[PDB]
A = this chain, B = another copy of it.
Amino acid sequence: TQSENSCTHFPGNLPNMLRDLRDAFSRVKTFFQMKDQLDNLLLKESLLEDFKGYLGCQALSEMIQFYLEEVMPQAENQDPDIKAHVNSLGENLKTLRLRLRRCHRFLPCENKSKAVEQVKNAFNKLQEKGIYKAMSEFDIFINYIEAYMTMKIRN
């Protein structure tokens, strides 16, 4: 929403959170280095370049979702004694994700427009009448799209 959070100890506790995250991976680092028997690199440096440019929020968001949904669910089931530690590592990753999304627009690609939620709330209460009113104001929707476009093509 119109961002800027209201979070205490922020952004001062960010380094502390990354240390908690590195300490949780340390509890599973040996198991996984021994299972991995290849010397090639997967997380290439082009990934770092994308994190630092204009699509960085989106590339980081997609990589957090990739690890929580396509990597962590199978790793956790690799041995009964690494399961609690792999789910704790996932929780520190989700706790970090939540702090950047909630506080002062640090993961803006994941925030949602409060004005859109309100229009959708009002539309749903008008029921059938919402369809006719959204269509009758379509020209106001074109005026809003043009304002977004002019803002980029104008000086």
Shortest beta-carbon distance from A151 to chain B in Å: 6
Interface string of A132-155 (1 = CB under 8 A from B): 111111111110111111011100
Interface residue A118 (Cβ < 8 Å from any Cβ of B): yes
Assembly CA distance A2 to B11 (angstroms)? 29
Interface residue A7 (Cβ < 8 Å from any Cβ of B): no
Interface residue A29 (Cβ < 8 Å from any Cβ of B): yes
Number of chain A residues whose Cβ lies closer than 8 Å to a Cβ of chain B: 89
Shortest beta-carbon distance from A118 to chain B in Å: 7
Which of chain A's residues 44-80 have a Cβ closer than 8 Å to chain B?
Answer: 44, 46-60, 62-63, 66-67, 70-71, 74-75, 78
From B18, B44, B116, contact of A47 by CB (8 A): B116
> Could you tell me if A59 and B116 are in contact, using CB atoms closer than 8 angstroms?
yes
Interface residue A95 (Cβ < 8 Å from any Cβ of B): no
Assembly CA distance A144 to B93 (angstroms)? 13
From B3, B35, B46, contact of A54 by CB (8 A): B3
Assembly CA distance A118 to B120 (angstroms)? 37
Assembly CA distance A98 to B42 (angstroms)? 32
Interface residue A84 (Cβ < 8 Å from any Cβ of B): no
Which of chain A's residues 103-146 have a Cβ closer than 8 Å to chain B?
Answer: 105-106, 108-109, 111-116, 118-120, 122-123, 126, 129-142, 144-146
Query: Which residue of chain B lies nearest to A62 when distances are taken between CB atoms in the complex?
Result: B116
> Could you tell me if B66 and A116 are in contact, using CB atoms closer than 8 angstroms?
yes
If A3-B55, A42-B126 are given as contacts, then 18 extra A-B residue pairs at C-beta distance below 8 Å, sorted by A number, are: A11-B153, A18-B142, A22-B142, A28-B135, A36-B132, A36-B135, A36-B136, A43-B134, A44-B119, A46-B118, A51-B145, A52-B147, A56-B151, A60-B144, A62-B116, A66-B120, A100-B149, A106-B152
